[PDB]
Design a protein around this ligand. Sequence first.
Ligand SMILES: CSC[C@H]1O[C@@H](n2cnc3c(N)ncnc32)[C@H](O)[C@@H]1O
Ligand SMILES: CSC[C@H]1O[C@@H](n2cnc3c(N)ncnc32)[C@H](O)[C@@H]1O
Lengths: 280, 281
Amino acid sequence: KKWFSEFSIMWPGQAFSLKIKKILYETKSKYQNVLVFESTTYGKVLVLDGVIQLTEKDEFAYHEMMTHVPMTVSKEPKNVLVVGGGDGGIIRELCKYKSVENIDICEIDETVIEVSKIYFKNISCGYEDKRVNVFIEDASKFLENVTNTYDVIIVDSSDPIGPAETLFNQNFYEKIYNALKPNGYCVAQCESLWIHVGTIKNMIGYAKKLFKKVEYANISIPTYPCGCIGILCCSKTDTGLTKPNKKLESKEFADLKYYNYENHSAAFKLPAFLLKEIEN
Amino acid sequence: KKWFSEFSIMWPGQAFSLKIKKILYETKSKYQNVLVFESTTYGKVLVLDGVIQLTEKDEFAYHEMMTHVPMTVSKEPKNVLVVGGGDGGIIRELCKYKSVENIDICEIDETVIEVSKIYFKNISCGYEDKRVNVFIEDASKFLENVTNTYDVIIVDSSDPIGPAETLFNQNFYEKIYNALKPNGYCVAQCESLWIHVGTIKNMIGYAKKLFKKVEYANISIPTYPCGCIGILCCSKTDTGLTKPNKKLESKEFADLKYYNYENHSAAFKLPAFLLKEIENI
Ligand SMILES: CSC[C@H]1O[C@@H](n2cnc3c(N)ncnc32)[C@H](O)[C@@H]1O
Ligand SMILES: CSC[C@H]1O[C@@H](n2cnc3c(N)ncnc32)[C@H](O)[C@@H]1O
């Protein structure tokens, strides 16, 4: 009985392994190597170019924090875009907001959507919502001509090596800024504070050229390297994304497993060493 | 270059590994297998029975949260007990409080204190402080017949597989409770909320039979399984441990790399699923 090991040039000197119960699917798509397996203790796992993208056991932490942070701050969002996120976990959490009109997703790799629909039904269930519109395209190309459209943009990308390489540069952030409404918000997956603080500082700096308020939050998730991942939070208004404007009290939100009102703000209380690195 | 991989029945089906620059020391003590190695990206690493105890790069997160949460709540803590903690990290943090009068440490395995002096001098530097008294004993035995003595008890244990087994039971918590002053506090290492909910529920339940207010806080640390570890927070007053009564702003605290006043309280804002489980204790 074998183990899967996640080793990368992006985090050298460390590795995380999961014991494999069985391999479910492996193929090479037009864009990336795609592996799906049942682990013995974290449920099903999705792997792209040898990097864990999700497990069934902990995916809610990431998907709920990335969605409910901006969606409890934006008032009356009508148009939201997911960049990347082919598994559909973000769309799942977005569907819970009954007054959103259009959920647009731009995913480069249609094989990730297919596989998610087949093997991760509890994640990909939102694709059935008739408000969902799917665009199969490089988001960097998709966003190049959009302006003044989205209330919230959620960048749920894979890591900078592979097709997401176009999503971690200044030009992309300008596109996000322009694609947003005047009071719109963006959140984006961003490097772990335990790995490359220099990358976080680079990303904050690209955002701060455009956005009035740029903040960083941490989410605990055991199957990403170092057991955590950042959220780069970008606001066009001065008030930012640290404090929710509403409580998720309706029935669609009863079963949340991570997010709540208090932990929203707590997510932005970062270790002292990081604060010092990003203050200056 | 070889890798070190951390396997345990306490975390089946997963493992974290670190690339080994060089092996520094390996010995079987009277109690456990002791390993020290230099990793390629985390510095030196202390391993006990095949489980990572600390690394140089991230040890401050655990030692600072474990220490400064109770020490900023207790108003005038003069006598403090560390259980376990042979490496010295909690003692280092405690020595920063000039107003502390006495620090007792009870550590079962003196080889771990010896190894820490040799290979972890930036962690073991407090053993030189003249306030520090060292007892080499199973803390379960040590605390029999200690009563109404400590303002703070900090239980920096290894995992419950091995000699720390005697620290993860109701009997231990009766001793802690008796050894603390009437407004004393205890904090105890209490495992990962991603995989140890069973243990976390058992421990909180033992503490709740004695203490009026029992809380749980989480610390981000990448070299413990799941990238986090919790603090079982035990108070004899109803106000508990979530709000500090002092700030760490003086020179002695200039070097803090994790803890601050907001982070203290934020540590206790737990994931929704964990809150639901703690409701079922
Ligand atoms: C699984 S969540 C991360 C996703 O980001 C998608 N992705 C990577 N690069 C891009 C890109 N340039 N545009 C849109 N989606 C992308 C990946 O194919 C993956 O499904
Ligand atoms: C390295 S910090 C953890 C410390 O807890 C110590 N320890 C484990 N069990 C006990 C015990 N029953 N009493 C005191 N210290 C202990 C271990 O030897 C280790 O040095």
